[PDB]
């Protein structure tokens, strides 16, 4: 009779940069998935598989909760068959996805004057990420023949860069907290 701790992931005090999509195995619990969308305090809740109500009526092996923070313009990129820096070099959804992408604005919580420069976005990776893959590597990027050998410099730039989250910024350039629900005996509704 345990209920799913979706709230534990959703209303989390502290999310995570996109380059480190945190994943919680929602498992062995009760999920009235409809009440999540009934919490229609959400900007984007589009379920590529089936509506929450229908799959509220359903069970899976496990449920995977992917939590991260991106910029508003890039909410589109957290979608199947989407091309973009976040999609290609940060978080990529399979072209065949059967889950729900959930998003809400967080300009209040994760913006500070001068900038919450504590959220990071990967700008350099030599090759597009495979579906549901995570790269935490901090090694210096080689844009040249010369090997860097660990010194930042020309043709040897640092991979992860940081969003500049200032409240005075535009809307599309504002913090948006995104939770991707993946659905693969445990969890019912």
């Amino acid at each position, epitope marked *: 009779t345990n209920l799913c701790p979706f709230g534990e992931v959703f209303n989390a005090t502290r999310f995570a940069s996109v380059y480190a999509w945190n994943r919680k195995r929602i498992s062995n619990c009760v999920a009235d998935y409809s009440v999540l969308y009934n919490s229609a305090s959400f900007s984007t809740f589009k379920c590529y598989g089936v509506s929450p109500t229908k799959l509220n009526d359903l069970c899976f092996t496990n449920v995977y909760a992917d939590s991260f923070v991106i910029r508003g313009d890039e909410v589109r990129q957290i979608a199947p068959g989407q091309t973009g820096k976040i999609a290609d070099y940060n978080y990529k959804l399979p072209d065949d996805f059967t889950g729900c992408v959930i998003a809400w604005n967080s300009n209040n919580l994760d913006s500070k004057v001068g900038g919450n420069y504590n959220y990071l976005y990967r700008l*350099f990776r030599k*090759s*597009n990420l495979k579906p549901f893959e995570r790269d935490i590597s901090t090694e210096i990027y*080689q*844009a*040249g*023949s010369t090997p860097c050998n660990g010194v930042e410099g020309f*043709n040897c*730039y640092f991979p992860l860069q940081s969003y500049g989250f200032q409240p005075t910024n535009g809307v*599309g350039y504002q913090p948006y907290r995104v939770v991707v629900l993946s659905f693969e005996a445990t969890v019912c509704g």
Partner: antibody
Amino acid sequence: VQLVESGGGLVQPGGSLRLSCAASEITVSSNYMNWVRQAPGKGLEWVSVIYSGGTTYYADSVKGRFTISRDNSENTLYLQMNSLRAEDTAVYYCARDLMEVGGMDVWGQGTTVTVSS
Amino acid sequence: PVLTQPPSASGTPGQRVTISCSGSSSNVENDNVNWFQQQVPGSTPKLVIYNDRLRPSGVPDRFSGSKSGTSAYLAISGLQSEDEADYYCVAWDASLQSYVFGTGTKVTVLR
């Protein structure tokens, strides 16, 4: 640190041309890279960008008429131009768009494309 | 699609010429306005200012820039004899995934 544009010039309207930019010291497969053009006595126009891991973006003034690519094994990028028109008569520049950690550094000399009869 | 930028600019030697560049809230409001210099039409451009206001390497402390919403500016301080050129500004717009150049301003020193 050099990029040499090496395409062609004169093409009948509605024809096709292939442009190429040979790269020295910049790994074209890793660094974003980007084509820009300048019409005769006019401003600069972004044509296409490629990314390291693919995912091209094109300008609406070309879309299907133009395509961009990276030679595998060879340190050259290309712009295949087809269904060409007189508007496209310009000078074309390859360039290194380091998005934020730098900018559009390292521009090429430019190949001179003249679309006419 | 273009970024609006004046056609002409003028100044005596030693003066500071401040080039405009104004665009939409999806253009120059963010996504880093880049600034370019081109001596002659077919010339190879040269990045004077990048990521709004930062400078590359080999660029004089003379050149400088600032941002104010719908418009950012290029401050060519300490106006040299050579600096007379066509100057351009660029910025990325998610709205129509592209880079948006400027009309170009021709700085003209008078001496």
